[PDB]
Swiss-Prot record, chain C:
The capsids of autonomous parvoviruses expose a proportion of VP2 N-terminus and part of that sequence can be cleaved of to form VP3. The N-terminus of VP1 is sequestered within the mature capsid. It contains a phospholipase A2-like region and putative nuclear localization signals. It comes from Murine minute virus (strain MVM prototype). This is Capsid protein VP1. It is found in: Virion; Host nucleus. It comes from the Viruses. Capsid protein self-assembles to form an icosahedral capsid with a T=1 symmetry, about 22 nm in diameter, and consisting of 60 copies of two size variants of the capsid proteins, VP1 and VP2, which differ by the presence of an N-terminal extension in the minor protein VP1. The capsid encapsulates the genomic ssDNA. Capsid proteins are responsible for the attachment to host cell receptors. This attachment induces virion internalization predominantly through clathrin-dependent endocytosis. The chain holds residues 437 to 485 of 729 of the full protein. Coiled coil: none annotated. Belongs to the parvoviridae capsid protein family.
Swiss-Prot record, chain H:
Belongs to the parvoviridae capsid protein family. The lineage of its organism: Viruses, Monodnaviria, Shotokuvirae, Cossaviricota, Quintoviricetes. The N-terminus of VP1 is sequestered within the mature capsid. It contains a phospholipase A2-like region and putative nuclear localization signals. This is Capsid protein VP1. The capsids of autonomous parvoviruses expose a proportion of VP2 N-terminus and part of that sequence can be cleaved of to form VP3. It is found in: Virion; Host nucleus. It comes from the Viruses. Capsid protein self-assembles to form an icosahedral capsid with a T=1 symmetry, about 22 nm in diameter, and consisting of 60 copies of two size variants of the capsid proteins, VP1 and VP2, which differ by the presence of an N-terminal extension in the minor protein VP1. The capsid encapsulates the genomic ssDNA. Capsid proteins are responsible for the attachment to host cell receptors. This attachment induces virion internalization predominantly through clathrin-dependent endocytosis.
Length: 549, 549, 49, 49, 98, 49, 48, 49
């Protein structure tokens, strides 16, 4: 019926300790999604081509030229960590647990309301009247078989809101069309012209135009109807909530000290290098900590800002996130730069249109690479090497003195063992879909939980078309009574975690909330102001260090 | 459905005599609560700092500087005696019963109605039209586990209305934030300046920002839905509906009279003091009624208007309410001064904005302290004492001649036996929540029935957000269609009482309603006027005296 | 709060003291945060040394 | 301490404790019993005390 | 030795002694000079001793918190004193054996 | 002096029950009919519960 | 965990002038350990 | 070792263990002696109670 409710608001997180040190976290999230009517009722193939950027010589990284199919459907996409958990829950989980794993996901749509707007004068200046449409419906389809392309709204920072008391909106669904884009590489104010800035026609071999009407089972929902998509059971791998510190010079047995320090200030000299036991791979007749044989390489070097190009334009190749070293440079190890809005964590007192940005420096301290202090010697090791026997991060590669050997050096090999990148709080992404290729990547840097079997079916909502009395199908007018709707979305994400074990003598690192000041973890960020302007800055995921080897 | 009702108005009180002199009172209360939309949809941390009061030297008692989290939820708080019982019921219970105890509490919300307002011209001057929203809901949460802070609306005189035929409103919910406030003590027009008037930043150690969305199970209620929170069973202690009169000079056996009076006018002389049997604790060789050894002290002396200060500002320490003596001063024994409004007992013919106030003088006549007639002698008792051997209520303590020894003298000890303070009619408070400390108080002066196990879960209501078609989540506009609602609240408070026993020969005191005049208990207060202006003044809770020892 | 703050800096004034509801134990005709009636005293004063 | 509450001045009762090396008995509340010949007085006391 | 003052974290039970004051029995704020006793007035004749040094306000409606255990150099348990009327707490140990 | 007004009864106060007095004592007493009883009676060691 | 904001926690800080530096709870070059007290009650709770 | 064991609806059973090597030296004398401490050098100075 139209006057009875068909669900319950629930937002609590329930921890349940089951078994020998395993907690069952039951995160719940309920929001009021505000579905507006689509811009047009047609599937349109729109093309973006920023010639004002790419026409300037040197702007190949500023390219975002593409084509997209813009669907009239909106996406209820909930894979971000801030949707389900409050910051106290994330702090308790990251301090108290040792690993996290996803179990299951229930989703629900209830309390549907559709309203149409009208005009009245009342003063000579017309105002809107929001009547009620008890017979108009909204269309819901869950793509549980993943026919349609997988577009996460965590890519565009367009998921559900992170504050439960504020109503949120649904992101519009659109996917990529496969047309060819070619851009000619050129540097800043180079003499000459840009040879290639073209974009191609649709190709007959690879063109996929999907409609959501021909591919899905669409449920109509009036004001008394509810929708519930049942328990999708995850088949992911656990992520670890502890971080590592051991580099390649901190693996194995330390060398035994020949002399010991008398006071608390001086050091202890080891056995001299020429008469020291151990194994190396160089041909010198001495063993040292730098050239000692290790079990495996912990972090690999990766090429800095390599812009590859294959039938779509120049794109930067993704780097595995690692720690920024004492050599503070963040671009080499691939620290992800997040840019989010007021719905997702920006302080609401920011009147400017610029977003809130944050560089996520990784806490995997053994996998980080120091680029200024990396060097390559000649094939027989003769230290100290001459000038022509060493390649450092000062020598020009090719002829370019702005580019050194670290920009092109890839040292990913068979004995390379790196760590999985940490989940990012609120403006993260929980899960992903595995790429449909025969040889998969070892990891996704967008999400820690890549679904092995099938991703959860993405939810697509739209409003049913409300027509006026005048409707010509062969006339492109579409009068279309101005309707909108609000509905309630409730989801349940089940997770399984393990409790932390305390082996170290010293007090280990913890994420504590500090007092009001210039510190990063002051409480006044996580408290509303006098006008209620909340703010969510990210939290450290991996406070507690763990032993690699 | 939208056209059928989901409950029944009930307001009767049912007395049921069960067992050997035990009555089961079944009080019922039904009101029409008027829920207006919140001022803003945000949780805001508002700060109150009255510098216009505390800047004046000598106004430390006028301080009400604090910080509060203001929630968008409203409180349906029913713990006041006037909600459940009519004045005839209170008079019959206080005359006829000997003790009262709380048993159980059922609560219910039904007959929900939500209405939106619009404008029309109709004369050139716009009027409101109150349409009906059959799909908008209201949110209800019962905090049965008491996660949220316990804020009784009987503190602010903001509970349900006491007249059943008038519609009432719900008080807004808000709780205390823990920031530091320091105020420097200074007297009237003192030479110098106020050193401390500061208020602090939020502290990282103790800051608790609770949301009602993340902590509760919220039920949405449309026009056809009902809510019912089941029987909370109380675990309180009984209060006594009889008052005491025996002081510390009326305990035990009276001294036997040596001579008896001949007529009805003269007195009877006892045995002379130097040759009288008995026990004392002084070293004199005579027994008297003043220095005779008693079983226990009945009333203790308590410091008058001590303003303590611990990390929040100066607050007066609470006194146990006792009787005002022949020395009429009410401040020493802590007579509570109630200030209430038209919904709670003020005469409706009072056009002024000032409230209706009433000092509640306690009827525990044995526990009262007379401050002008209290005195302290030296350690060996030598009566009549000299000037330097006695400290009375005229001598200056410190150097202040306005402060005597009774202002600082606390005589609470191990052999102190006082009486529980009486419940106050209509503008009282029925129950309270026990403070979450390891060493609890012996009593609460705000409520006679402190719940031992758990307080009943406080009920929180709000209106669901009705949005217009324009809604930007990253824009702080919130157009928000102007809605309101009315609902019906029905509650059942079960109580158990015992019937009074008549042992005395003489007619005992009773609360009788007198004729129209200048008396306190004239009937014209409890009768409506020509325009229907009702009024509730308090009634005596403990008319019948009882024997202490 | 009678009035609410517009920005994030200012405070919110409550109802004036002479016309405010509540309970006290003093005999004055106004209610304030310092003299409002509480359920119990939380900390007690104790004699120094 | 002679308190007074609606019946006249009465001394507040003390818990009995030991008299110290500071021999004073009034401070710790040593009870002073006054009894007769039926209850323990020597019967050879001709006085009324 | 190594010394350390253990400041308690029971922020609601703390008392501010300089900002405590006592007014006269009918409340008239702002009080005069002879109507208020602050932490500047001499008790007896000693100007180094104020009213906070002698003021005990432990009463029936007093609800304080149990003192926290102290790490390493604490004390875990204690023995209850063999008297008829026991203390409510021991400040040397949080776990008094019943 | 200050000892005449100083009360130091507190939460961590543990005193002993006063001893019964031979012949001219009192054996039992009746508990006072108040809601908050004394911890002891100084007239009798055996207060009937 | 009922509160929205991150609550206080006893975390071990880096080597410096702070009270909770790790170098107190680590032995020196000659093995001179040291135990300074820790906060027992980091997390605030609601009294009433 | 210290063994944490989560048993029931949110209850952990901590099992702390402690092993030391105690070094018992022979007593100073084999007699029970009633020794008296009296610091007259402190308490003889006025103000050192």
């Amino acid at each position: 019926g139209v006057g009875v409710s068909t669900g319950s608001y629930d937002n609590q997180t329930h921890y349940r300790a089951l078994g020998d040190g395993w907690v069952e976290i039951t995160a719940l999230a309920t929001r009021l999604v505000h579905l507006n009517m689509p811009k047009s009722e047609n599937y349109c193939r729109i093309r973006v081509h920023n010639t004002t950027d790419t026409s300037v010589k040197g702007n190949m990284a500023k390219d975002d030229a593409h084509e997209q199919i813009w669907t009239p459907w909106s996406l209820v996409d909930a894979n971000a960590w801030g949707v389900w958990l409050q910051p106290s829950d994330w702090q308790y989980i990251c301090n108290t647990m040792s690993q996290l794993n996803l179990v299951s996901l229930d989703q629900e749509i209830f309390n549907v309301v559709l309203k149409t707007v009208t005009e009245q004068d009342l003063g000579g200046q017309a105002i809107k009247i929001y009547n009620n449409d008890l017979t108009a419906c909204m269309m819901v389809a869950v793509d549980s078989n993943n026919i349609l392309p997988y577009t996460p709204a965590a890519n565009s920072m367009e998921t559900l809101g992170f504050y439960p008391w504020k109503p949120t909106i649904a992101s519009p669904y659109r996917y990529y069309f496969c047309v060819d884009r070619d851009l000619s590489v050129t540097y800043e104010n180079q003499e000459g012209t840009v040879e290639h800035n073209v974009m191609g026609t649709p190709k007959g071999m690879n063109s996929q135009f999907f409609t959501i009407e021909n591919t899905q089972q669409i449920t109509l929902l009036r004001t008394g109807d509810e929708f519930a998509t049942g328990t999708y059971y995850f088949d992911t791998n656990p992520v670890k909530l502890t971080h590592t510190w051991q580099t390649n010079r901190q693996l194995g047995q330390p060398p035994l000290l020949s002399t010991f320090p008398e006071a608390d200030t001086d050091a202890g000299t080891l056995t001299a290098q020429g008469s020291r036991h151990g194994t190396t791979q160089m041909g010198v007749n001495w063993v040292s900590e730098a050239i000692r044989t290790r079990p495996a390489q912990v972090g690999f070097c990766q090429p800095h800002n390599d812009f590859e190009a294959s039938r779509a334009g120049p794109f930067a190749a993704p780097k595995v996130p690692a720690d920024i070293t004492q050599g503070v440079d963040k671009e080499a190890n691939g620290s992800v730069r997040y840019s989010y809005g007021k719905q997702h964590g920006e302080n609401w007192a920011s009147h400017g249109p610029a977003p809130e940005r944050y560089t996520w420096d990784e806490t995997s301290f053994g996998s980080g690479r120091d680029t200024k202090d990396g060097f390559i010697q000649s094939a027989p090791l003769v230290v100290p090497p001459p000038l022509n026997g060493i390649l450092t991060n000062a020598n020009p590669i090719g002829t370019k003195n702005d580019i050194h050997f670290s920009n092109v050096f890839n040292s990913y090999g068979p004995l390379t063992a790196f760590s999985h990148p940490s989940p990012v709080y609120p403006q993260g992404q929980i899960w992903d879909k595995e790429l449909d290729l025969e040889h998969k990547p070892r990891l996704h840097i967008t999400a820690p939980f890549v679904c092995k079997n099938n991703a959860p079916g993405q939810m697509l909502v739209r409003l049913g078309p409300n027509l006026t009395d005048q409707y010509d199908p062969n006339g492109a007018t579409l009068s279309r009574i101005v309707t909108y709707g609000t509905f309630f979305w409730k989801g349940k994400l089940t997770m399984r975690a393990k409790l932390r074990a305390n082996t170290t003598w010293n007090p280990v690192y913890q994420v504590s909330a500090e007092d009001n000041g210039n510190s990063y973890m002051s409480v006044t960020k996580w408290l509303p102001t006098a006008t209620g302007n909340m703010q969510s800055v990210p939290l450290i995921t991996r406070p507690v260090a763990r032993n690699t080897y």
